[PDB]
Structures are given as C-alpha cells and as structure tokens.
C-alpha cells in the first residue's frame, strides 16, 4: 500500500514503518558548507569491469536494473567503507518536472533525478541479512541534471517501453553501469537509511559531488512509466522521491574541499 501519492506518499509512511521518524533516515539535505572535509577518507573504489546485469524490473515504485551478486563481480570498496560491497541493483528517483526529482539535495538544490547503485556488505552473505545490519548496505547516489544526453544511459531508456507497468520485467544483459558514472569520484558520506519502506537504517550513503547530464528526451521517457499495473488506469510514475529528512545528530563528511 505505500506509494508516492496524496494518500500513501512519504508523509504517511510512518504509520506502517515507524522507523520513518527514526534517528538516521534518508535522504538529507547536504549543506556543502557544514559538511566536514576528511583527509583520512580514502578514494572510492568502483570495480564494475565484471558486472553482470540480468534483468530490468518495474516494481511499481521505480525501475530496477538487477545484477548477479552471487560472486564478487561489481564491487564498491574504499571511500568511507570497511569492507567489500557487491552491486545488487540500480534504480532512479525523478520528478514530474526537471526542477525536482532528486532525494538528496545540495544546499536545498533539487536535481532532475537521482541514481542509486545499491551494494551489500559481503560479510553478511546476502542482501536480506545485510539490511538488518547497521553497516549492511552502501548506496552510491549520483545526481542527474538535464542538458547533454548520457550515451551510457540510452540502453536503459530504450527498454522502458517493455516494462511500462507494475510487475513487468525484461531481460537486460551486458549493461555496463560504468557508463553512468561522472568523471570525478569526490563524494559526501553519512550514515542513513533506505529511502523507501521498509526504511531500514542500514545504509552508508556515498553521494557524488559531480552530477551526470541526461537529455530532456531521456528523462521524458522515465516519466512515461506507470505506477499502476497493466489492467489499470494510468498514473504516471513521476515524483517517486522522498523529501529530505531531519539530519539529527549526524555529520556529513566530504572526501574533498
Ligand atoms: N532508495 S534506496 O535507499 O537506494 C533503496 C530503495 C529500495 C531498496 C529495496 O531493496 C527495497 S526492497 C527490500 N528492502 C529491504 C528488505 C527487503 N526488500 C533498497 C534501497 Cl538501498
Ligand atoms: Zn533509491
């Protein structure tokens, strides 16, 4: 039942998932001025050379591109992290308009969209167990602005017609998520949560400073997807973002000045 509308959107989630109001919820606004530079933060290590995409799914909240995470193929490590985290899926949040859509904000600035590359700590053996741990997940957040097309995104945009409605899936092999990365890997990092229910507080958030550019036509195709299932009245999949949540104790660290 949760969703992104007037009656079941983020303001209502706390009734089914009381952790919605917890001590380390995401996303947050990143105040770039108060984020602390940390010279001891390591470069982020993204090894996506051996990534095996399997499938793309409309889950009725977003679309997921899923990866084979049964061996250490596509891994995140270094940066603020202490272990190896395997890529399990990526998905996006986006707006009804180019002026909004990102979950994290940068000095209150909203980006047209936000990419989440979700990874789980190898120590916990699988994603299901990892989410029950305070360091179980590492999510790499990348902002999208609208200008130039991202050539590496087109393969994803062209299959969306095949997964229009809730519960549809399509095979989606040999997609290289390295084509979604910006140039710089400078990042902010803070401890947080899933941004959708179950809102589990198991995430180390690694948000890239440098946004990627996507074309107006690429993001327009995101907006043609549907929250509803195939038998049902059309509700465009738009505005599937959770607003910034209270920072509370937390400190956001920066890998850069
Ligand atoms: N917006 S986000 O924080 O990157 C994010 C959104 C959805 C999910 C899920 O996997 C939800 S499905 C699920 N979640 C917990 C336990 C069993 N299944 C995971 C993440 Cl990290
Ligand atoms: Zn997400």
Curated annotation (Swiss-Prot):
Its main location: cytoplasm. The gene is CA2. It comes from Homo sapiens. This is Carbonic anhydrase 2. Changing residue 89 to P: In OPTB3; in Czechoslovakia. Catalyzes the reversible hydration of carbon dioxide. Can also hydrate cyanamide to urea. Stimulates the chloride-bicarbonate exchange activity of SLC26A6. Essential for bone resorption and osteoclast differentiation. Involved in the regulation of fluid secretion into the anterior chamber of the eye. Contributes to intracellular pH regulation in the duodenal upper villous epithelium during proton-coupled peptide absorption. The lineage of its organism: Eukaryota, Metazoa, Chordata, Craniata, Vertebrata. Changing residue 139 to G: Weakly impaired activity. Activated by X-ray, histamine, L-adrenaline, L- and D-phenylalanine, L- and D-histidine, L-His-OMe and beta-Ala-His (carnosine). SMART domains: Carb_anhydrase (SM01057). GO terms for biological process: angiotensin-activated signaling pathway; carbon dioxide transport; morphogenesis of an epithelium; neuron cellular homeostasis; positive regulation of cellular pH reduction; positive regulation of dipeptide transmembrane transport; positive regulation of synaptic transmission, GABAergic; regulation of chloride transport. Belongs to the alpha-carbonic anhydrase family. Target of drugs used in treatments against glaucoma disorder and breast cancer. Changing residue 61 to G: Impaired activity, not rescued by 4-methylimidazole (4-MI). It is linked to Osteopetrosis, autosomal recessive 3: A rare genetic disease characterized by abnormally dense bone, due to defective resorption of immature bone. Osteopetrosis occurs in two forms: a severe autosomal recessive form occurring in utero, infancy, or childhood, and a benign autosomal dominant form occurring in adolescence or adulthood. Recessive osteopetrosis commonly manifests in early infancy with macrocephaly, feeding difficulties, evolving blindness and deafness, bone marrow failure, severe anemia, and hepatosplenomegaly. Changing residue 59 to D: Strongly reduced activity. It catalyses: hydrogencarbonate + H(+) = CO2 + H2O; urea = cyanamide + H2O. Pfam families: Carb_anhydrase. Changing residue 195 to S/V: Reduced activity. Zn(2+) binds at residues 91, 93, 116. Changing residue 4 to H: Reduced proton transfer rate. Changing residue 64 to L: Reduced activity. Changing residue 62 to S: 2-fold decrease in enzyme efficiency, as determined by kcat/KM ratio, and efficiently inhibited by chlorzolamide.
